[PDB]
Write a protein that binds this ligand. Structure first.
Ligand SMILES: COc1cc(N2CCC(N(C)C)CC2)ccc1Nc1ncc(C(=O)Oc2ccccc2)c(-c2c[nH]c3ccccc23)n1
Ligand SMILES: [Cl-]
Ligand SMILES: [Cl-]
Length: 270
């Protein structure tokens, strides 16, 4: 369905402010001003580094069509693309930033129902990706964006088509990426939220992660988590990928807990 993806001319968007930058490229805050209309749309613009892959513009556009077909309230949808020497991707601006920064900045004013609702919404978005037979490969708290405080969206997937501390052991050892390896990354993401933005395996070099996982060590239990919540996180980190919970089960379990949030999370002033 080609109509779902707007082909943009360079004059229809302008870069205002830099939001993030790295080896992939740079994400700008900007405005989309379609020529015919009289509107200025807040957007995020990710410009990819030139000459990173041999894929021509024709093959890139076909992959972009898939990203534009993602229709789920908890997964970011590709709004437009600009194909010059560099590939530029346009999506809606998420004004509150990424969820990792949000929980760090508001760690004193976040209650149990907020945290459990985020866990539900992230599981809903990942379950949709699994329904579309799409593997994310880089699920993390930094890759969950906050549209409003109680509406989050998963971002930065399909860009892949090394985050060792978020990867399932089979991804580190065998480069295997499935929906069940996404579940491992979901467990680490939930761990980031329950610790209000702590770094996983803090103080341990990335090159040592596989050995400690093979020795049976895992991320420690967050203090606010009751045993019911931690055991769900621990099951996401089982060696047997098919023994890990499914995203559809995680939706049900975290939805049930969200009905009685103070029973499952113990938070000061909650
Ligand atoms: C006010 O808006 C924001 C601000 C801040 N800042 C606040 C604090 C700063 N200091 C003080 C700590 C640093 C951070 C972060 C985020 C957003 N909102 C946003 N909206 C939409 C996308 C997004 O969909 O981008 C795309 C676009 C096309 C294709 C794929 C992804 C993104 C986004 C996705 N991947 C990224 C990688 C790096 C940076 C941003 C993004 N972010
Ligand atoms: Cl808040
Ligand atoms: Cl960090």
């Amino acid at each position: 369905n080609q109509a779902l993806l707007r082909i943009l001319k360079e004059t229809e968007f302008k870069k205002i402010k830099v939001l993030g930058s790295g080896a992939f490229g740079t994400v700008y805050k900007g405005l989309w001003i379609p020529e015919g209309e009289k509107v200025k749309i807040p957007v995020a613009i990710k410009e990819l580094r030139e000459a990173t892959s041999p894929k021509a513009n024709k093959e890139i556009l076909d992959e972009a069509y898939v990203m534009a077909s993602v229709d789920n309230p908890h997964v970011c949808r590709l709004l437009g693309i600009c194909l010059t020497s560099t590939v530029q991707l346009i999506m809606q601006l998420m004004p509150f930033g990424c969820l990792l920064d949000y929980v760090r900045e508001h760690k004193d004013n976040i209650g149990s129902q907020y945290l459990l609702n985020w866990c539900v919404q992230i599981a809903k978005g990942m379950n949709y990706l699994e329904d579309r037979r799409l593997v994310h490969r880089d699920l993390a708290a930094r890759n969950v964006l906050v549209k409003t405080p109680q509406h989050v969206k998963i971002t930065d997937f399909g860009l892949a088509k090394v985050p060792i501390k978020w990867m399932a052991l089979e991804s580190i050892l065998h480069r295997i990426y499935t929906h069940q390896s996404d579940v491992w990354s979901y467990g680490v993401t939930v761990w980031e939220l329950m610790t209000f933005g702590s770094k996983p395996y803090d103080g341990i070099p990335a090159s040592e992660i596989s050995s400690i996982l093979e020795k049976g060590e895992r991320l420690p239990q967050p203090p606010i988590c009751t045993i019911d919540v931690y055991m769900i996180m621990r099951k996401c980190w089982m060696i047997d990928a098919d023994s890990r919970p499914k995203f559809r089960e995680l939706i049900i379990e975290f939805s049930k807990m969200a009905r009685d949030p103070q029973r499952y999370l113990v938070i000061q002033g909650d």
